Amino acid sequence: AYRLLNKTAVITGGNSGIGLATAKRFVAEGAYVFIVGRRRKELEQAAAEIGRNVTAVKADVTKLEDLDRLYAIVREQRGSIDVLFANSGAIEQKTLEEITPEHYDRTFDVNVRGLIFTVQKALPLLRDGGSVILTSSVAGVLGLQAHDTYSAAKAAVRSLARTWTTELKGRSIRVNAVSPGAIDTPIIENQVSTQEEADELRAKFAAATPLGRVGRPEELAAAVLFLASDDSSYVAGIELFVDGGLTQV
Amino acid sequence: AYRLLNKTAVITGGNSGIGLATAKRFVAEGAYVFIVGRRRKELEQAAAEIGRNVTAVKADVTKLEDLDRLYAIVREQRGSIDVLFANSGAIEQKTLEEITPEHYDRTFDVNVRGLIFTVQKALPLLRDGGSVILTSSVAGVLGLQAHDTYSAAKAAVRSLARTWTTELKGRSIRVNAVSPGAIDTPIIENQVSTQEEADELRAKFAAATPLGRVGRPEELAAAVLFLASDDSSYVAGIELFVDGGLTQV
Amino acid sequence: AYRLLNKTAVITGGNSGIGLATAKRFVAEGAYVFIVGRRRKELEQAAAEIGRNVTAVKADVTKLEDLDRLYAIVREQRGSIDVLFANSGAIEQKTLEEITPEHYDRTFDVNVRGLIFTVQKALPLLRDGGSVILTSSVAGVLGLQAHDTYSAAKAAVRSLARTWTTELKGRSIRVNAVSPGAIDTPIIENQVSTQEEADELRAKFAAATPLGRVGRPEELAAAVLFLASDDSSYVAGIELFVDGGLTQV
Amino acid sequence: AYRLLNKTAVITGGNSGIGLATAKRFVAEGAYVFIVGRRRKELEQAAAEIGRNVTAVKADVTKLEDLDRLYAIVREQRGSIDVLFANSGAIEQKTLEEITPEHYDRTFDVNVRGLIFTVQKALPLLRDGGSVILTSSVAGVLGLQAHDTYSAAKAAVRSLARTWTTELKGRSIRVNAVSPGAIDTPIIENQVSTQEEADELRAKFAAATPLGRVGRPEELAAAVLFLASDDSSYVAGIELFVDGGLTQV
Ligand SMILES: NC(=O)c1ccc[n+]([C@@H]2O[C@H](COP(=O)([O-])OP(=O)(O)OC[C@H]3O[C@@H](n4cnc5c(N)ncnc54)[C@H](OP(=O)(O)O)[C@@H]3O)[C@@H](O)[C@H]2O)c1
Ligand SMILES: NC(=O)c1ccc[n+]([C@@H]2O[C@H](COP(=O)([O-])OP(=O)(O)OC[C@H]3O[C@@H](n4cnc5c(N)ncnc54)[C@H](OP(=O)(O)O)[C@@H]3O)[C@@H](O)[C@H]2O)c1
Ligand SMILES: NC(=O)c1ccc[n+]([C@@H]2O[C@H](COP(=O)([O-])OP(=O)(O)OC[C@H]3O[C@@H](n4cnc5c(N)ncnc54)[C@H](OP(=O)(O)O)[C@@H]3O)[C@@H](O)[C@H]2O)c1
Ligand SMILES: NC(=O)c1ccc[n+]([C@@H]2O[C@H](COP(=O)([O-])OP(=O)(O)OC[C@H]3O[C@@H](n4cnc5c(N)ncnc54)[C@H](OP(=O)(O)O)[C@@H]3O)[C@@H](O)[C@H]2O)c1
Numbered sequence: 004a005y006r007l008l009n010k011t012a013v014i015t016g017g018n019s020g021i022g023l024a025t026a027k028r029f030v031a032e033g034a035y036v037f038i039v040g041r042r043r044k045e046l047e048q049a050a051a052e053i054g055r056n057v058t059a060v061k062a063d064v065t066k067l068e069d070l071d072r073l074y075a076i077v078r079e080q081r082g083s084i085d086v087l088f089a090n091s092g093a094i095e096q097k098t099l100e101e102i103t104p105e106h107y108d109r110t111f112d113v114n115v116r117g118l119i120f121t122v123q124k125a126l127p128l129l130r131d132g133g134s135v136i137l138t139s140s141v142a143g144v145l146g147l148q149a150h151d152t153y154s155a156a157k158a159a160v161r162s163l164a165r166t167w168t169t170e171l172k173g174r175s176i177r178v179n180a181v182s183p184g185a186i187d188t189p190i191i192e193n194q195v196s197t198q199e200e201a202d203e204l205r206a207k208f209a210a211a212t213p214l215g216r217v218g219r220p221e222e223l224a225a226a227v228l229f230l231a232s233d234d235s236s237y238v239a240g241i242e243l244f245v246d247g248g249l250t251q252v
Numbered sequence: 253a254y255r256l257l258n259k260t261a262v263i264t265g266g267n268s269g270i271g272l273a274t275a276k277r278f279v280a281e282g283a284y285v286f287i288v289g290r291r292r293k294e295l296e297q298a299a300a301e302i303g304r305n306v307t308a309v310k311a312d313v314t315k316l317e318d319l320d321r322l323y324a325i326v327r328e329q330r331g332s333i334d335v336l337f338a339n340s341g342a343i344e345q346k347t348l349e350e351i352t353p354e355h356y357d358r359t360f361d362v363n364v365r366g367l368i369f370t371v372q373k374a375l376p377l378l379r380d381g382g383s384v385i386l387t388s389s390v391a392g393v394l395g396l397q398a399h400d401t402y403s404a405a406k407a408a409v410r411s412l413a414r415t416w417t418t419e420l421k422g423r424s425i426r427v428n429a430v431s432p433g434a435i436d437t438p439i440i441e442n443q444v445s446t447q448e449e450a451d452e453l454r455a456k457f458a459a460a461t462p463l464g465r466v467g468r469p470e471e472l473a474a475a476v477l478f479l480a481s482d483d484s485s486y487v488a489g490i491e492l493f494v495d496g497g498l499t500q501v
Numbered sequence: 502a503y504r505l506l507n508k509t510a511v512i513t514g515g516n517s518g519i520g521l522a523t524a525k526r527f528v529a530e531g532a533y534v535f536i537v538g539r540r541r542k543e544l545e546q547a548a549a550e551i552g553r554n555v556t557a558v559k560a561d562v563t564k565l566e567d568l569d570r571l572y573a574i575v576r577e578q579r580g581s582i583d584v585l586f587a588n589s590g591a592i593e594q595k596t597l598e599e600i601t602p603e604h605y606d607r608t609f610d611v612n613v614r615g616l617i618f619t620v621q622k623a624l625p626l627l628r629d630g631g632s633v634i635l636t637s638s639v640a641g642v643l644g645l646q647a648h649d650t651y652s653a654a655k656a657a658v659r660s661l662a663r664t665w666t667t668e669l670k671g672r673s674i675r676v677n678a679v680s681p682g683a684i685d686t687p688i689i690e691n692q693v694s695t696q697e698e699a700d701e702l703r704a705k706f707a708a709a710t711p712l713g714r715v716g717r718p719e720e721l722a723a724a725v726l727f728l729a730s731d732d733s734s735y736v737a738g739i740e741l742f743v744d745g746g747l748t749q750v
Numbered sequence: 751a752y753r754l755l756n757k758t759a760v761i762t763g764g765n766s767g768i769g770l771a772t773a774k775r776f777v778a779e780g781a782y783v784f785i786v787g788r789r790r791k792e793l794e795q796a797a798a799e800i801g802r803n804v805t806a807v808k809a810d811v812t813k814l815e816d817l818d819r820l821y822a823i824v825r826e827q828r829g830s831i832d833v834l835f836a837n838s839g840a841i842e843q844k845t846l847e848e849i850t851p852e853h854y855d856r857t858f859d860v861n862v863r864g865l866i867f868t869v870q871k872a873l874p875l876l877r878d879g880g881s882v883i884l885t886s887s888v889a890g891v892l893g894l895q896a897h898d899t900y901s902a903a904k905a906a907v908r909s910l911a912r913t914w915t916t917e918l919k920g921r922s923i924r925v926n927a928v929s930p931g932a933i934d935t936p937i938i939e940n941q942v943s944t945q946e947e948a949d950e951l952r953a954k955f956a957a958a959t960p961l962g963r964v965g966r967p968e969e970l971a972a973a974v975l976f977l978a979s980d981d982s983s984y985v986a987g988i989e990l991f992v993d994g995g996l997t998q999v
Contacts, residue, residue, distance in 0.1 A: 099866075099913075116851075146916040147750075155910055158906055159862075166897055219486070225483035243487070248488030251488060252643060252645075348665060392660060393663075397668060403660045410656065489644055713919065732972035733976075746919070
C-alpha cells in the first residue's frame, strides 16, 4: 500500500497548495517529509494538518545560508534524501513594457536561481537511485499575455531537468519536470486584485482545458508521486504535463 | 494497496513482452484483464502465468470481425471497460529504397489501422471516466535508419491520443500515449537474424540512454499503470516517454 | 535576384492552392517546374497561369505506375531533380465513431502512402545536395475535432522527414517538413457543404491565430522557397510552422 | 535582388561571428545596420569589413543606460527599426556542483536579462509589421554536460518569443527564435583552454550532426534573413533550428 515506505523527502514550497498536498500524499505513502517555506505560521499549520512524519523548516530558497541550514537539519534528523521536490516558485504578471529590473530579479531568483541552489546543495545528501522533481509550468511552452518572466523562468526549469539528467546519470538519480496547468491553489488567488476576478480566471481556464475543469492539488501530488516512486524508474528528464490536455490539443 | 480494484481492462498484445507484464501488474492491482493476441499457445501460457482474474481472447486487430467478437466476449463476461491498453504493434526494418507496398501495409495495418478500430469498437463499452493508453514509441520523434514506416505509424498513434482527447472529453475519458525506448522484450529479438546481433543492439541502446540500460517490461507496465490509475486523473493527451532519458537529452 | 536559377523542381499537387503558388514563385526565382496532379483541365490552366518554364504531368500519387511515368518524363525533359516538393494531400472530416475503412484508406493513401512512393521513386533522379520538402500540417501537433486520420497522417509525414534526414545524409540531401496553419486555398472550401460555412471556418481560424488572419498561398510558397533554396543549407529534418503563431502560443 | 531594401536593422552582438555575418548579409540585401557590442576595436573593424550603410554603437546590454543611449542614436540616425536581431549572448561551462552565484548572474544577465531589456526598449522605435529575432540555441532542448545555466537561459529566450508573439500581435510585429547548433564562430574557441581541444570539439559536433559538418556563420545569417524578410510574413513565435539536423533525428 505504501509506495514511499521509509523514503525521506524534501519539498520546498511545502506549506501551501501543491507542495502541501504532495506532502500529505507522501506521508500517506509512508515517507518522512521535510516541508520548507518562509512563513512560520503556515509551516506550523501545514505540519499540523499533515499530522505525522513531518518536519517544518523555515527557509528562503533565494538565501544560500537558509539552504545550508535546511540541509544541516535534514542531515541531522534523517541523514539522506530519497525524493527532492524543488517546488517553491512564484508569479507576478507584467507585460514586456511594464518589466522592471526588480520584477525580473524577483521572478528569476525564486523560480530559477533558488531552485538551482536547492538542487546543488542537496547533492551530498541525495541517495544514489533517488528522484528529483522540478515544478515547471504549462506557461513554459505557451505564449500567455503578461507572463513574460514567469514563463521564461519555468522554461528554464524544464531545461535544468534535461541537463541534470546527464550530470547525475552516473549516480542513477532521475530528474524530471512536472508542468501543471490550472490547479486550484493560492497562486491563482494571490495574483488577482479582487475575489470576483478569480471566479472568472478559473472559468476561463476550465473552458480552455479538454477535461473542462481546473485541477485539484491532490491530482498534481499524485503525478509527482509517480515521478517520486519506483513506477517511474525508467522515466528520466521528461516534462510531465498535468493540465487536463491544455497544451496537448 | 489495489489501485485498479474491480476495474476491467483490455490489453491487445497481451500474450507477450509489454502487454503481458502490464497484465500481471494490472491483476496484482486488482483488475480483471482481457489479454488479446493471435497466437493461441502463447495466450494460454500468458493466462497461466498471470494466474487469476484473466481471460484470453484470440483476435487479430487488423480483422474487424475479430474485434467485434472480442468486444462481444468482453461484454458478456464483464459488461464494461475501465482501461483499454491498445498495445499490439509490430516492426519490420526497411529503408526508403527497400519499401514495398506489402511492407507498408503490414506496418500501418497493425500499428495504426488496427489500433484505430480497437478504440472505435471499444467506445460502446468504455465507461465514462475511463482511460485509454496507446503505445507509441521513441521512434515517433526520432530519425532512425530503416525505421521509415514503423516510426511514421507510431507518430500517427501519438496524434490519435490528441484527437481522441478532444473527441472523448465529453465522456471524461482520458486518452494518453506511452512512448517506450529500448525495453527488454521479444520485439528486439524478433527483428534481428542472429542471437549475436541482439547482444549488440542492446548494448548500443544502453550507451545512448542516460540511465545506461535497456528498460525492464515491469517498468513500462508501471508507467502504463500510472496512466490507467486515478493518479493520472488530470493527465490528458500526453506522450509519456519511458526511455531512461533517450529522447530527453 | 534568382534564388533557384536553373534548378529543376517537381511539385505534386501543383495545379491548385499551395502547390500552384509555389510553382509560380519557383519559376519567378528561375526554376524549371513540373506540376503534378490528377485533373487535366486544372493542370493545363495552372501551366497557362505560370506561363514559362513549366511542364504539367497528369499523375495519381496513389498509383505506382503513374509515378514511374512521371519520373520517366522528368528524366527525359530535364534529367535530374534539385527540389522535390511532395505536397499533394487531402482531408475528409470524420470523428472516431464515423471512421470507415474506406475513409481511412483514402486519407492514408494520398497523405502518407502516395508521399512515401513519391520520394522513393525520385531518389535516382535526385541531385546530391538537393532539397525535399514534405507538406505536413498544424493538425499533426493538434487535437482537432473529427480530424482523426488527417492529423495522424500528417504527423506521419513529419516523422518521415526525420527518418529521411538520416537515410539521405550520405548524399547531402536535405529533407524538411513544412506545416501550414490556415491558408486561403481550395482545401478549406472543398470540405464544407455550404459557402456560408466557409466564411465562418475562416473567421474562426483567424481568431485563434496571433497574426489575426488566414495565410495567403504566396506566404506558404515563400516558406517552401526558403527550404528549397541555399538559405536553408544548414537546416535539416525540421518542422517549419507557417501558421501565424497558431501552434506556438 | 534586395530583400531588405531600405529597412533599418539593429543587431546586438554584431562585431563578431553570427552577429557580423548577418550584418554583412543584411547590408548586401540593402539594409541599414546598427552593430552593437562592448569592444570598440572590434566594432570599428566589423564596420570596416561591412563597408557601407553601417553604424557601430558601443553598448553593454546588461546596462540599461547603454541601451537608452543605443536607442537614442538609432532614433537620431534612422528614426525607426524594421528588424531587431537580439543576438548578444555568452556561454561559460560549469556543472551543477561548480555553479557559483557570480556564474549564474553572468549567464542570465547577458543571455536573458539583457535581451529582455534590448527588446523592451526597442518597442517605441519598432515599426508596425516589423520583425524581432532572438538567438536561442540547440542547448535549450538538449541535456549537455556542464551547460546548466547556458541551456536554461536559452530555453528562457525561446519562451520569450512565444510570450512576445502574443503581446505584440496587435502591432503585427513577428517575434521568432533562431536556435543554432554548432556554428564556426569565436564562441567555440573562447570556451576551450587550448587550440588543440577546439579541433576536437568541432570534430565531435560534426559526428553528431546528420549533415556531417559545423555550420558556416553565413548559413545562420541566411536563416535569420528569412525571419527578417517578407518571406516569413506568416511565421510567428517559432523555434527555427539551424543545426544540420542535430536536434531533429
Ligand atoms: N497552481 C497552478 O495552477 C500552477 C500552474 C503553473 C505553475 N505552478 C507552479 O507551482 C509552484 C508552486 O505551486 P502552487 O501553485 O501551489 O503555488 P502556491 O500555491 O503559491 O505555493 C507556493 C509555495 O512556494 C513557496 N515559496 C515562494 N518563494 C519562496 C522562497 N524564496 N523560499 C521558499 N519558499 C518559497 C511558498 O512558501 P512561503 O510562502 O512560506 O515562502 C509556498 O509554500 C510554483 O513554482 C508555480 O510556478 C502552479
Ligand atoms: N520494447 C521496445 O524496445 C519498444 C520500442 C518502441 C516501441 N515498442 C512498442 O511496444 C508495443 C508492445 O511490444 P512488445 O514489447 O509486447 O513486443 P512484441 O511482444 O514482440 O510485440 C507484439 C505483441 O502484440 C501482439 N500482436 C502483434 N500484432 C497483432 C495483431 N495484428 N493483432 C493482435 N495482436 C497482435 C503480439 O503477439 P500475438 O500475435 O500473439 O498477439 C505480441 O503480444 C509495440 O506496439 C511496439 O511497437 C517497443
Ligand atoms: N492550405 C491549408 O489550409 C492547409 C492546411 C494544412 C495542410 N495543408 C496541406 O497542403 C497541401 C496542399 O493543400 P492545398 O491547399 O493545395 O489543397 P488543394 O487546393 O485541394 O490542392 C491539393 C492538391 O493535391 C492534389 N492531389 C490530391 N490527390 C492526389 C493524387 N492521388 N495524386 C496527385 N495529386 C493529388 C490535387 O490535384 P488534383 O485534384 O488535380 O489531383 C491538388 O492540386 C496538402 O498536402 C494539405 O494537406 C494545407
Ligand atoms: N556558433 C554556435 O555554435 C552557437 C551555438 C549556440 C548558440 N549560439 C549563439 O549565437 C549568438 C552569437 O554567437 P557567435 O557565434 O557570434 O559568438 P561570439 O563571436 O562570441 O559573439 C557573441 C557576441 O555577443 C556580444 N556580447 C557579449 N556580451 C555582451 C554584453 N554584455 N553587451 C553587449 N554585447 C555583448 C559580443 O560582443 P562584445 O564581447 O564585443 O560585447 C559578441 O559580438 C550567441 O548568443 C550564442 O549564444 C552560437
